[PDB]
Paper text:
For CfAM, there are two monomers in the asymmetric unit comprising residues 19 to 459 for chain A and 19 to 460 for chain B, which superpose with an r.m.s.d. of 0.3 Å. Two conserved disulphide bridges stabilize flexible loops in subdomains A and B. There is an additional disulphide bridge in CfAM, located in the C-terminal domain. In particular, CfAM shows the highest pH tolerance, retaining 70% of its activity at pH 8. Although all three amylases were co-crystallized with acarbose, a well-known inhibitor for amylases, a complex with acarbose bound was only obtained for TeAM and CfAM. As expected, the acarbose was found in the substrate binding cleft in each monomer of TeAM and CfAM, with the acarviosine unit sitting in subsites -1 and +1. The catalytic nucleophile D190/D192(CfAM/TeAM) is in a near attack conformation poised to react with the anomeric carbon, whilst the catalytic acid/base E214/E216(CfAM/TeAM) forms a hydrogen bond with the bridging nitrogen of the glycosidic bond with the 4-deoxyglucose in subsite +1. In CfAM, a secondary binding site in domain C was identified and modelled as maltose located at the edge of the β-sandwich. The glucose units are held in place mainly via hydrogen bonds without the usual stacking interactions with aromatic side chains. The additional binding site in this domain in CfAM strengthen the role of this domain in substrate binding. In addition, a new previously unobserved carbohydrate binding site was revealed in the C-terminal β-sandwich domain of CfAM, which might be important for the initial interaction with its polymeric substrate.
Here, we describe the structure and function of three novel α-amylases from Cordyceps farinosa (CfAM), Rhizomucor pusillus (RpAM) and Thamnidium elegans (TeAM) with a higher stability and pH-tolerance with the potential to act as novel biocatalysts for various industrial processes. The sequence of all three enzymes groups them in the GH13 sub-family 1 along with, for example, the amylase from Aspergillus oryzae (also known as TAKA amylase). All three amylases have the classical domain structure with a central (β/α)8-barrel with the active site located on its C-terminal face, together with a small subdomain, inserted between the third strand and helix and a C-terminal β-sandwich. All three amylases have as their hallmark a shortened loop between β2/α3 and two shorter loops in subdomain B located between β3 and α4 of the central (β/α)8-barrel, compared to structures of other fungal amylases, e.g., TAKA-amylase.
Residue numbers in the entry: 19 to 459
Write the structure that this text describes.
């Protein structure tokens, strides 16, 4: 599917090894060693498509699917591009997962790596010429202040860095992504390690995909990130990630979030193609950093209802709180896939708002109220409106703001209350327990 189709999607980002063990997995004692395979499978994820859909997601980003070197539970350590990772299942089981998702109106986005291979023996790498030393840069330690180093040095000391300027390597990866997409029928691609490969590799690779591509450029600098924005369909919104977290963890005002939202939006071709996220598999979970479910809900209100494509990290809906990798990659079966959890029902409510408004694909995010401790905005000409704050659990405040809609009525989706703006479009609302208020006409 094309960029335009993805703009209205809502993405659940899952580690395949960490969702479900089988079609019959309805929960169990968790996985003890999070640095090793926990036993999630394609067939297990297939049995959880209803669980995912029931919160309002209509797309799943899965970690890489290719055969990996030892202990590559996360998929990022390729050893054979043209074989599936047997720990998750066979090729036919991967097709069955995708086909099951398509039958339920769900897109599958596949994560891919072109920068590097795994840490297994060179002589087991496939296909040719990946088993030749000459296919790689000599090993060097990355200096993140030097772009040459970022591109030619190793992302980790044991992960050989491909010589991506070699025409033979460029054709290997183009032919491979075309085969992958044709064979398995994926709807989109997440491109790992984009800043680690020279820019002129990317357009041909992205176009070979045949679908929307979203790139990972791990940087808070919006100028740097936006320099990749014309090479692929969208980018992960790392620039917003930083001040998003600083506001909702009570570290800074909302002004830096609004500033960065405006700045990155102005620098890319189409800010509706950016992927908005609060946490992921490479950073501690929100609740590890700030143990306050009210603040998490406020932050997630931005993720779900701001401009851009929301990307929610699996386990958020069970209030997971693990810290740095691998502790942020807890299995989901320990939670027993509780569809009555507080966070599950929260995601389900915001998913219903998105569904009733077309998946909110517009470039129509109007800042309404921007203060030390509060942020409100609307979408769709005032049809949907969010008031968020960083006051925290157990706190009450009144916030009054101009809605730009005269004499208009909304319903609070959480509290059921009727909210009416005045003749001047001014609305006052009182936040309770630090919880966000979402308003729908
Ligand atoms: C992970 C991420 O790293 C890089 O991001 C950098 C970024 O480029 C930097 O600029 C900087 O970011 C700055 C930012 O620019 C600023 O604007 C902001 O203000 O501050 C931030 C933070 O300073 O830092 C980040 C993070 O370092 C890449 O650019 C990015 O693409 C990466 N994300 C991708 C990439 C990969 C690789 O495909 C995936 O990671 C996977 O592979 C790693 C490496 O194997 C694995 O790591 C875990 O397992 C390792 C084995 C373990 N290391 C142990 C092994 C040793 C010997 O072998 C010991 O030497 C070592 O001490 C041991 O700990 C790792 O610690 C452990 O994390 C991942 O699990 C695996 O997933 C990413 O997932 C993918 O999204
Ligand atoms: O509630 C204060 C103020 O917030 C908003 O103004 C933003 C503006 O939209 C941003 O572009 C940037 O300039 O930050 C301003 C706040 O410092 C509302 O737009 C405005 O109506 C309201 O009074
Ligand atoms: Ca490289």
């Amino acid at each position: 599917a094309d960029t335009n189709s993805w703009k209205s999607r809502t993405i659940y980002f899952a580690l395949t090894d960490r969702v479900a063990r089988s079609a019959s997995d309805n929960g169990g004692d968790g996985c003890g060693q999070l640095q090793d395979y926990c036993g999630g499978t394609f067939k297990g994820l297939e049995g959880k498509l209803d669980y995912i859909k029931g919160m309002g997601f209509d797309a799943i980003w899965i970690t890489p699917v290719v055969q990996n070197s030892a202990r590559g539970y996360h998929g990022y350590w390729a050893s054979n591009l043209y074989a599936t990772n047997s720990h998750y299942g066979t090729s036919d089981e991967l097709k069955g997962l995708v086909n099951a998702a398509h039958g339920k109106g769900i897109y599958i986005m596949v994560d891919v790596v072109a920068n590097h291979v795994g840490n297994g023996p060179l002589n087991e790498m496939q296909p040719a010429p990946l088993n030749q030393g000459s296919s790689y840069h000599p090993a060097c330690g990355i200096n993140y202040n030097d772009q040459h180093s970022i591109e030619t040095c190793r992302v980790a000391s044991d992960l050989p860095d491909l010589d991506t300027t070699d025409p033979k390597i460029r054709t290997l990866y183009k032919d491979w992504i075309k085969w992958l997409m044709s064979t398995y029928k994926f709807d989109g691609v997440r491109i790992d390690t984009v800043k680690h490969v020279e820019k002129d590799f990317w357009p041909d690779f992205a176009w070979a995909s045949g679908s929307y591509t979203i790139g990972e450029v791990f940087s808070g600098d919006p100028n740097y990130v936006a320099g990749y924005s014309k090479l692929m369909g969208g980018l992960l919104n790392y620039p917003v990630y930083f001040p998003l977290n600083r506001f909702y963890q009570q570290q800074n005002s909302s002004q830096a979030l609004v500033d960065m939202h405006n700045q990155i939006g102005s620098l890319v071709p189409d800010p509706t193609t950016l992927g908005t996220f609060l946490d992921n598999h490479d950073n501690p979970r929100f609740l590890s950093q700030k143990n306050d479910v009210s603040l998490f809900k406020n932050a997630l209100t931005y993720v779900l209802l701001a401009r851009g494509i929301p990307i929610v990290y699996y386990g958020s809906e069970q209030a997971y709180a693990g810290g740095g990798d691998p502790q942020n990659r807890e299995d989901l079966w320990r939670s027993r896939f509780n569809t009555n959890s507080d966070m599950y029902k929260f995601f389900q409510a915001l998913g219903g708002v998105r569904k009733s408004h077309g998946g909110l694909p517009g470039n129509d995010h109007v800042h309404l109220f921007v203060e030390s401790d509060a942020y409100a905005w609307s979408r769709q000409d005032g049809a949907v409106m969010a008031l968020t704050s960083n006051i925290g659990k157990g706190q009450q405040r009144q916030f009054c703001f101009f809605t730009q809609k005269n004499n208009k009525t909304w319903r609070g989706i959480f509290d059921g209350k009727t909210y009416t703006s005045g003749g001047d479009g001014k609305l006052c609302a009182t936040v309770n327990n630090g919880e966000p208020i979402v308003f729908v006409a």
